[PDB]
């Protein structure tokens, strides 16, 4: 038996982890109506993308990995002797990448494809990749790994803050009054992931208090977990995420694993500027 683990680009794993474990990545893309295209990778400048988003009078569109990017990587790993491929995708409730990875697995002969719906995104989804890789080293078969990841999914979630109200109306999800009235009070919509979908949770005035709301809600949940891994997932507001990150280091015990990360263009294309989230996993994920 020879098991491999791959994922899509929205897992936002560091290039250090990608290189160390030779993780293959099927990238997503974001295409402005300028015709400008950004294929997600650890090479494009995230600052250039945020500048084009502010300059673009229309919101861009994101695309799942094309049914083909999966196929070549499936063919490449099978050639290298891999008998089973575990594919970790972002939430099927917000993207079709999970479906494309499954359908492409039906067209590649001579290798078993085990597509997994993480029901999340960013480094929270990447935690499923690092848990699968760890289990392969310990001698687990793919079915035990899928069952473990399915159990892990039961104690995994995330809350997030929306900051760019201008980006919301450019997409049409809010009005002009609500956009205008919202920025003057500085109302921050707080949302959370639930069964792979993003649903409204609270509406909080000022970003500082919404960050404190993220901390209280997540901490109240992970108190009951035997193992805890917390992930600050920040946008382009460096000071916002660092404040929450350092606040967690002071308020949480060392038994909690607390880490910091940032999301890429595909997530930024939907969140806009100033996005910030707090994810959690009920496990002690190996981040090295
Ligand atoms: C703390 C973890 C969560 C951080 C915030 C993540 C919110 C994600 C927003 C929606 C992204 C949609 C991606 C669609 C991809 C596609 O085109 O198939």
Author numbering: 1 to 288
Question: How is this structure described in the published paper?
Answer:
The crystal structure of FakB1(A121I) was determined at 2.02 Å resolution. The prototypical FakB1 closed conformation was exemplified by molB, but in molA, the dynamic region undergoes a significant structural rearrangement. Excluding the structural rearrangements observed in FakB1(A121I), the open and closed structures superimpose with an RMSD of 0.356 Å showing that the conformational change is confined to these residues. In FakB1(A121I), the bulkier side chain displaces the middle of the aliphatic chain of the FA by 0.9 Å and its distal end by ∼1.4 Å that, in turn, shifts the tunnel residues Val162, Leu191, and Leu271 and pushes against the dynamic region. In the open conformation, Arg173 becomes disengaged from FakB1, and the newly formed 12-residue helix that we designate as α8′ has a distinct exposed hydrophobic surface consisting of Ala177, Trp180, Val181, Leu184, and Leu185. We also note that the disengagement of Arg173 from the FA and the outward movements of α8 and α8′ disrupt the hydrogen bond network surrounding the FA carboxylate by breaking the key Ser171-His270 hydrogen bond and exposing His270 to solvent. The FakB1(A121I) is the highest-resolution crystal structure and was used as the representative open conformation for further analysis. Analysis of the open FakB1(A121I) crystal structure reveals a groove created by the conformational change that forms a channel extending from the FA-binding site to the electropositive end of the protein.
Staphylococcus aureus FakB1 is a prototypical bacterial FA transfer protein that binds palmitate within a narrow, buried tunnel. This study focuses on FakB1, an FA transfer protein from S. aureus that binds palmitic acid (16:0) before presenting it to FakA for phosphorylation and exchange with the membrane. The bacterial class of FA transfer proteins is called FakB, and the bound acyl chains are completely enclosed within the protein interior. The open conformation arises from a conformational change in the dynamic region that rotates helix α8 outward to uncover the FA-binding tunnel and reorganizes the adjacent α8-β9 loop into a new amphipathic helix.
